[PDB]
């Protein structure tokens, strides 16, 4: 809020205003799989006999 | 150094503010060259 | 406000003059031209100051 | 990636300084418009400067406290009807009222009233439009229909402190008021070296920007005024706070 | 449409034309008149007569 | 056809609940009232029909 300075004397400065910063950076995710086609003789529930 | 920052958008965190008065009922401005006003408020009760 | 300058070529490097410098040099190396008003001033003035007074 | 001449820079936050300058005036006015069609009597102080006091003539019945028997909230939201109330606190006015200013604390007690409520639909018997379920939210000022004559308007104004932020008008109040009625932004003639010497004194705002002499040279961005905002009638508006 | 052409023309004073509600001048916004970038005015603020001065 | 009342004589005759029925049938009235003053803060006002 601006002031009711008498118009004669004098006026505090005010402050300039800025400044703020952050990180977050990296993140990540790795869902490995695989295959092992050993299993592939067995049949699958899909796959009728 | 050697850290490689980039930066993104910048939020602004505005400030609301709205008159809602300067142009509902004081649509009307008048500078000055005195140092005071005078209102008039005109009495009329007729009989 | 703030007051921002710009520098302007004199004219485009294709030949086309962007921009057109037109006075009277009294001397060689005169990049600004003064006004005839500069002979007469302060005897004009004091002239209308008399005629006021 | 991407810097900038600090010069540039500069430009920027000289932009921003005048732009939170135009801000912080601004405010300023509001807040004396809030006052003076608030209650009447508007006085400003700070330190530094000496008090000042304006008094609009306003009247005792003009802003009408409701503390008594059954103001507004021992009234059963069932049976009872503001809207004779209302028309009491309209008819000394002296004047056509249009608007019924309200805060955004109070209106939610308003429209409990269930007289209104099924005042709404009728069919034949009342064609003030009415907006709940509020039609702007997280916004400034939001309409809300026509109660008849009368526009419904919620004000939701906050107005910064030195560090913190506050309404504008109290908790629960109203204004009862008119669009035709006339208010003056009175702006004083400016008492400055420079604006006398230019003979501007008589300006709405005055913005100054300059540097100091002396070789650590610093510069300096001003904006100045002598608001005296009022209004020619003051009993033309009734200020009632809610119980 | 009852004469053959429709315009009509009004001589305004520039006493009736200022800024709106006496605002104050901007880069684009001058002594009510609202002009672009390059300087071309754009739209002008003309005030209705103010006789009376009620 | 005219049943001009006072500003506070209206009031009585418009908080009873006959009048309030009667403005809802849907298909029993015409008439156009109007509660929620329509006209205030001034002179004589007409209140519909």
């Not at chain 4, 900038?4 to 820079?9: G, H, K, N, T």
């Not at chain 4, 008021?177 to 501007?200: F, H, K, P, S, V």
Request: neutral net charge; hydrophobic residues 35%; aromatic residues 10%.
């Amino acid at each position: 809020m601006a002031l009711y300075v008498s118009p004669i004397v004098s006026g505090e400065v005010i402050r300039s205003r800025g400044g703020s910063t952050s990180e977050f950076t990296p993140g990540y995710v790795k869902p490995k799989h695989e295959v092992n086609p050993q299993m592939t003789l067995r049949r699958l529930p899909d796959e009728d006999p | 150094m050697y850290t490689t920052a980039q930066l993104l958008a910048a939020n602004e965190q505005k400030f609301k503010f709205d008159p809602l008065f300067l142009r509902l009922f004081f649509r009307e401005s008048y500078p000055f060259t005195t140092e005071k006003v005078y209102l008039s408020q005109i009495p009329g009760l007729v009989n | 406000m703030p007051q921002k300058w710009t520098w302007i070529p004199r004219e485009l490097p294709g030949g086309r003059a962007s921009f057109i410098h037109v006075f009277e040099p009294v001397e060689d190396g005169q990049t600004r031209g003064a006004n005839v008003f500069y002979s007469v001033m302060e005897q004009m003035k004091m002239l209308d100051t008399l005629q006021n007074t | 990636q991407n810097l900038a001449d600090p010069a540039y820079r500069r430009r920027r936050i000289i932009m921003q300084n005048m732009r939170d300058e135009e801000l912080a005036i601004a405010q300023v006015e509001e807040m004396q418009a809030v006052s003076a069609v608030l209650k009447g009597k508007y006085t400003m102080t700070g330190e530094a400067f000496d008090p000042v006091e304006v008094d609009m003539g306003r009247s005792e019945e003009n802003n009408i406290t409701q503390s008594g028997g059954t103001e507004w909230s021992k009234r059963d939201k069932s049976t009872y009807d503001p809207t004779d109330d209302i028309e009491a606190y309209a008819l000394n006015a002296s004047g056509v009222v249009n608007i019924i200013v309200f805060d955004p604390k109070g209106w939610a007690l308003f429209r409990s009233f269930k007289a209104v409520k099924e005042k709404l639909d009728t069919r034949r018997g009342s064609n003030s439009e009415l907006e709940t379920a509020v039609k702007d939210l997280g916004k400034a000022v939001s309409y809300k229909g026509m109660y008849g004559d009368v526009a419904i308007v919620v004000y939701s104004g906050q107005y910064v402190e030195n560090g913190v932020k506050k309404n504008f008008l109290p908790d629960n109040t109203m204004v009862l008021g008119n669009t035709q009625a006339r208010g003056l932004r009175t702006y004083g003639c400016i008492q400055d070296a420079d604006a006398q010497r230019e003979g501007i004194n008589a300006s709405a705002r005055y913005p100054k920007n300059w540097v100091t002499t002396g070789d650590p040279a610093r510069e300096f961005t001003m904006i100045q005024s002598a608001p005296l905002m009022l209004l020619a009638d003051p009993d033309e508006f009734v200020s009632v706070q809610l119980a | 449409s009852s004469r053959l052409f429709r315009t009509q023309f009004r001589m305004v004073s520039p006493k009736r034309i200022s800024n709106p509600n006496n605002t104050g001048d901007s880069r684009n916004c001058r002594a009510g008149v609202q002009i672009n970038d390059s300087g071309a005015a754009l739209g002008y603020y003309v005030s209705e007569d103010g006789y009376p001065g009620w």
